[PDB]
């Protein structure tokens, strides 16, 4: 949590203030104090508008959409209405002539309620401009009220009455209460039957000491809850979750109560968050958290477990006497007032915007700052101040881009400073942008524009400065794109994948999938691709042979994919969602052909977004704007290797042998000092045809006979002949025979079978390959048969 801005107007010093957040669209913040003005600010503390009043602001409220702010004032009959789409102020005379005492918009209906000191009511409709005066609704000042989802209006007054009404102001119900009503709210009791959706019940605080309940279906049986005097007076209460209330009390305590059938008023939880004074509570269902303020501090807790303190903020001694808390509905901002007349605004959540190019990453770190880093090379993080709140961010080798709607802004990532190059405006809303080398590719309206980030007239080609895809003028829409050191790549609604080669400035491959291609994710070089189709099925594509492979167990929840940037693990990638990362390996070369294998899954902490994979370490952006690193479960062998010994080294060795990392596997076998590990390394060197390394390993094992035999074969360049001899050394005689028959020297199969004394197979081979050897083979077989009887 970080303080964005503070309001400290000289006109408000020494008096309390009131404020309101634009509700459903939290872009504006209305504020007022003893200067008879309402001032409207903008999430950045800059004043956009002001409303002048003939006296103190009595109340203010925003409409259901945040399009209109309503205000009422002392010594006035006019409501003041301010419009967020025009920034204009207008007036509405209440048609009574009394001082107003209450003001509230409906949650659903464009209605505005207005109560008076004499207990009269007005209901206004902003959409039809209809006024509905109702005289004598209360006998004294209307103090409080609430609107329900059915446009029913409940009102409390100093006459110790509660009244419930339709949107036309008619009285549905009237009730008398033991003390003056305050903090009136509507709710729904969650009965076991799913069939009721009407919020049939009212909660209210009486005399600042008891919480009272009125049920519109059972009005003959209201409930009073009384609380321990050691808590002090009730300061505030809020509804949260399924059927719970949280109540804050003056002596630093808060309590949570059940409202389930048979448990109404049962205490679920209690805490003394503050020692001397608790001044306000504010609950966000959007973050699932609560903020509390008291003793010159803010204390924030998780609604999943109220014991778990998320944040404590301590405020400087100038801020003595805390006032009121409120959040934006999106839970992006928290605001706090003081009794001395200051306002403070804090960031509660940051938009999770970030990107990567090779080992270099960019991520949002404040609403107007992007940080670029290279955690692999150890380059110091570079902070870029940006001219707009971005909707998208992209990074290259030498550049950063950010943008909003149909515009982007470009920056050079120099060693000494960051310099803004240019802003650029596209023909429609940019869905995404990608950078590589000093090219950028931007997607808008189903078309991709490739263009240079930097250029000059010196040897320029006008066709290279920019190009627009599909450049063949196909009827297809591009749904996704990616950019590499050498290729622009994109996928379409017609299911086409295309590669465009930047150096020649031409198309180089084209593949057609049976359904639309929704997303694409290339390796760092572009030589392989992951794509996701319209069914959310994942596929590897290999443009070099034009082949495709289905990714097994690929969850439809997967949001994205990252390839491993570590130079040995080029076939490794990950796919991810909000809860998990899945590690996949493309085995290009195996006896069973090419395939994709799920190597395992790693759990991801809440709202972390993956940016970079390097050597089984996953760098993620957090909601705080910071990065964090997660080791994959599939890479748990990477450790201080000597303490586990074989227990982490054996899976490391198996992984390294599959990755062909024989120099590492030798050092691991040296640390292991196990004859079985040396034999597994030797067998792997033979399977992977690494004869020079197999010679070294067998020389360490001391198997001189295998070393001499491998030294004889070392010069063989025929793949099938060499593989035949190595299969013979691994005792796989059937594979050895097939490979020798496919080789330049089929006779080696006959010789092998003769040497193994497999005389029937040797004779069958001799019939096809060397009929002149049949008599000699038959004599040697006959000698063996004569001995056998």
From Swiss-Prot:
Gene Ontology CC entries for this record: ciliary tip; cilium; cytoplasm; cytoskeleton; intraciliary transport particle A; motile cilium; non-motile cilium; photoreceptor connecting cilium
Residue ranges of WD repeats: 11-51, 52-92, 95-134, 137-175, 273-311, 317-356
UniProt keyword annotations, A-Z: Cell projection, Ciliopathy, Cilium, Cilium biogenesis/degradation, Cytoplasm, Cytoskeleton, Disease variant, Ectodermal dysplasia, Flagellum, Leber congenital amaurosis, Nephronophthisis, Repeat, Senior-Loken syndrome, TPR repeat, WD repeat
Tissue: Some isoforms are tissue-specific. Highly expressed in the prostate. Lower expression in the cerebellum, pituitary gland, fetal lung, and pancreas. In normal prostate, expressed in both basal and luminal epithelial cells. No expression detected in fibromuscular stromal cells, endothelial cells, or infiltrating lymphocytes. Uniformed expression in prostate adenocarcinoma cells.
GO biological process, one term: protein-containing complex assembly
Regulation: induction: By androgenic hormones. Expression increased 3-fold in an androgen-stimulated androgen-sensitive prostate adenocarcinoma cell line compared with androgen-deprived cells.
Tagged with keyword Nucleus: no
Assembly notes: Component of the IFT complex A (IFT-A) complex. IFT-A complex is divided into a core subcomplex composed of IFT122:IFT140:WDR19 which is associated with TULP3 and a peripheral subcomplex composed of IFT43:WDR35:TTC21B. Interacts (via C-terminal region) with IFT122 (via C-terminal region). Interacts with BBS1. Interacts with TTC25.
Protein name: WD repeat-containing protein 19
Originating organism: Homo sapiens
Source species taxonomy: Eukaryota, Metazoa, Chordata, Craniata, Vertebrata
Designated gene of the protein: WDR19
First and last residues shown, out of full length: 1 to 789 of 1342
């Amino acid at each position: 949590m970080k303080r964005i801005f503070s309001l400290l107007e000289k006109t408000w010093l020494g008096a309390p203030i009131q404020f309101a957040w634009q509700k459903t669209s939290g872009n504006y913040l209305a504020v007022t104090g003893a200067d008879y003005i309402v001032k409207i600010f903008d999430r950045h503390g800059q004043k956009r508008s002001e409303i002048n009043l003939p006296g103190n602001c009595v109340a203010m409220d925003w409409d259901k959409d945040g399009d209109v702010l309503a205000v009422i004032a002392e010594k006035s009959s006019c409501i003041y209405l301010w419009d967020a789409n025009t920034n204009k102020t207008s007036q509405l005379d209440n048609g009574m002539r009394d001082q107003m005492s209450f003001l509230l918009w409906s949650k659903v209906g464009s209605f505005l309620a207005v109560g008076t000191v004499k207990g009269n009511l007005l209901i206004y409709n902003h959409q039809t401009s209809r006024k509905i005066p109702v005289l004598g609704k209360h006998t004294k000042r209307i103090t409080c009220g609430c609107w329900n989802a059915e446009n029913l209006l409940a009102l409390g007054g100093e006459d110790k009455m509660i009244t419930v009404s339709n949107q036309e102001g008619d009285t549905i119900r009237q009730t008398q209460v033991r003390s003056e009503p305050s903090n009136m709210q509507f709710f729904l009791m969650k009965m076991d039957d799913r069939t009721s959706a009407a919020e049939s019940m009212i909660s209210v605080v009486l005399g600042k000491k008891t919480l009272f309940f009125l049920n519109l279906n059972e009005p003959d049986n209201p409930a009073d809850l009384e609380f321990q005097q050691d808590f002090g007076n009730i300061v505030c209460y809020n509804w949260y979750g399924d059927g719970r209330i949280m109540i804050g009390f003056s002596c630093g305590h808060f309590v949570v109560i059940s409202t389930h059938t048979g448990e109404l008023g049962q205490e679920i939880f209690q805490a003394r968050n503050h020692k001397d004074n608790l001044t306000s509570i504010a609950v966000s269902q959007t973050l699932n958290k609560v903020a509390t303020c008291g003793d010159n501090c803010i204390k924030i807790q998780d609604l999943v477990d109220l014991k778990d303190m998320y944040v404590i903020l301590n405020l400087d001694e100038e801020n003595k006497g805390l006032g009121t808390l409120s959040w934006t509905d999106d839970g992006q901002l928290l605001a706090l007032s003081t009794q001395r007349g200051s306002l403070h605004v804090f960031l509660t959540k940051l938009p999770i915007l970030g990107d990567a190019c090779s080992t270099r990453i960019a991520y949002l770190t404040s609403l107007l700052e992007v940080t670029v880093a290279n955690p692999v090379e150890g380059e110091l993080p570079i902070t870029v101040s940006v001219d707009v709140e971005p909707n998208f961010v992209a990074v290259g080798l030498y550049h950063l881009a950010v943008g909003m709607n149909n515009r982007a802004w470009f920056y050079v990532l120099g060693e000494n400073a960051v310099k803004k190059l240019k802003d650029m405006e596209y023909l429609g809303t940019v869905a995404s942008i990608c950078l590589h080398s000093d090219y950028a590719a931007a997607l808008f309206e189903g078309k991709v524009q490739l263009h240079l980030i930097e250029s000059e007239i010196l040897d320029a080609q006008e066709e290279r400065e920019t190009r627009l895809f599909p450049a063949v003028d196909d009827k297809c829409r591009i749904l996704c794109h990616a950019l590499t050191s050498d290729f622009l790549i994109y996928g379409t609604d017609t299911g086409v994948v295309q590669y465009f080669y930047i150096e020649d400035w031409q198309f180089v491959n084209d593949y057609r999938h049976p359904v639309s291609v929704k997303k694409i994710f290339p390796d760092p070089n572009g030589t392989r691709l992951v794509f996701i189709d319209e069914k959310s099925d994942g596929f590897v594509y290999c443009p070099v042979n034009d082949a495709t492979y289905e990714i097994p167990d690929f969850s439809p929840t997967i949001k994205g994919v990252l390839w491993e940037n570590w130079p040995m693990d080029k076939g490794v990638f990950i796919a991810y969602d909000d809860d998990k990362v899945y590690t996949y390996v493309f085995h290009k070369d195996t006896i069973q052909g090419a395939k994709v294998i799920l190597a395992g899954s790693t759990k991801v902490p809440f709202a972390h977004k993956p940016l970079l994979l390097y050597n089984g370490e996953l760098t993620c952006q957090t909601q705080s704007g910071k990065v964090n690193n997660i080791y994959l479960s599939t890479h748990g062998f990477l450790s201080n290797l000597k303490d586990t010994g074989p227990d982490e080294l054996r899976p490391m060795l198996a992984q390294n042998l599959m990755l062909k990392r024989f120099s590492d596997a030798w050092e691991m076998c040296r640390i292991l000092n196990d004859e079985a590990a040396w034999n597994e390394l030797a067998r792997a060197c033979l399977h992977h045809m690494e004869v020079e390394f197999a010679i070294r390993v067998y020389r360490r094992i001391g198997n001189v006979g295998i070393v001499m035999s491998l030294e004889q074969i070392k010069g063989i360049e025929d793949y099938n002949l060499l593989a035949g001899h190595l299969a013979m050394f691994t005792n796989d005689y059937n594979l050895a025979q097939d490979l020798y028959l496919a080789s330049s020297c089929p006779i080696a199969a006959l010789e092998m079978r003769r040497d193994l004394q497999h005389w029937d197979s040797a004779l069958q081979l001799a019939k096809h390959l060397a009929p002149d050897q049949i008599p000699f083979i038959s004599k040697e077989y006959a000698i063996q048969l004569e001995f056998a009887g």
